């Protein structure tokens, strides 16, 4: 629940869409057991789609480590230093190509609650409301019951 969890505001990393779009994914690190039943779907991702994924995003360098693991992992590292290690244990090929394209779409910010759905840094153009908007001025600025 939102009082038990932290929060943050809506933000991009380095104004990600203004000048150019920079893909925020930096690395992907797969660990797939060759003789191992849990990595049987992830072995086919390395077989089929890890060449095809590595040509849709050239700015992400991919590692396939292939050691004796019991639970295969993908360690997605982002440009701002956040590390998402998600577990692809006993997933199909289809559930990983959605898993890995989701890590290549998101920014490296926390998946804690976002406070507002909008973030303007210059939110007012006609001047923010202060109490003296929509009030009339009087002659010589006299406050009430001011004689001179």
């Amino acid at each position: 629940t939102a009082r038990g969890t932290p929060s943050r505001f809506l933000a991009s990393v380095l104004h990600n869409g203004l000048g150019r779009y920079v893909q925020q994914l930096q690395r992907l690190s797969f660990s797939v057991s060759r003789d191992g039943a849990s990595s049987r779907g992830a072995r086919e991702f390395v077989e089929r789609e890890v060449i095809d994924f590595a040509r849709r995003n050239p700015g992400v360098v991919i590692y396939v480590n292939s050691r004796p693991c019991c639970v295969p992992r993908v360690v997605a590292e982002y440009l701002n230093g956040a590390v998402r290690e998600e577990s692809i244990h006993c997933k199909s090929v289809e559930e990983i190509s959605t898993l890995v394209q989701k890590l290549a779409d998101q920014s490296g910010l926390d998946v804690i609650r976002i406070r507002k759905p909008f973030h303007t840094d210059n939110p007012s153009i006609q001047g923010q409301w202060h109490p003296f908007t929509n009030k009339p001025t009087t002659f010589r600025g006299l406050r009430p019951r001011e004689v001179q």
């Binding site: 060759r34 191992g36 039943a37 049987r40 072995r43």
Partner: protein, 91 residues
């Protein structure tokens, strides 16, 4: 109020506002328009006799052919040999 306000012999009095009246007078006007649109049938009972009997019979014969066509599904060598794949490895 002596016991359980809205039940019993000595109930709590409830009164009608204009709001609850204009909610009720406006339901009555919607109602009375339906008395007028139900007042003029296009055919009579003699003209619509059997006028949808060819489609009504055909609709049930698709409900009947839906119900008499239950069976266990076909069972393949595909789903059985595909469990041998759980020990697929690399060389």
């Amino acid at each position: 109020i002596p016991g359980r306000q809205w039940i019993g012999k000595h109930r709590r009095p409830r009164f009608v506002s204009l709001r609850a009246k204009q909610n009720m007078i406006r339901r009555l006007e919607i109602e009375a328009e339906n008395h007028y649109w139900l007042s003029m049938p296009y055919m009579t009972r003699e003209q619509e006799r059997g006028h949808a009997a060819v489609r009504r019979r055909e609709a049930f014969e698709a409900i009947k052919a839906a119900a008499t066509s239950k069976f266990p599904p076909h069972r393949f060598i595909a789903d059985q040999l595909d469990h041998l794949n759980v020990t697929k490895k690399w060389s």
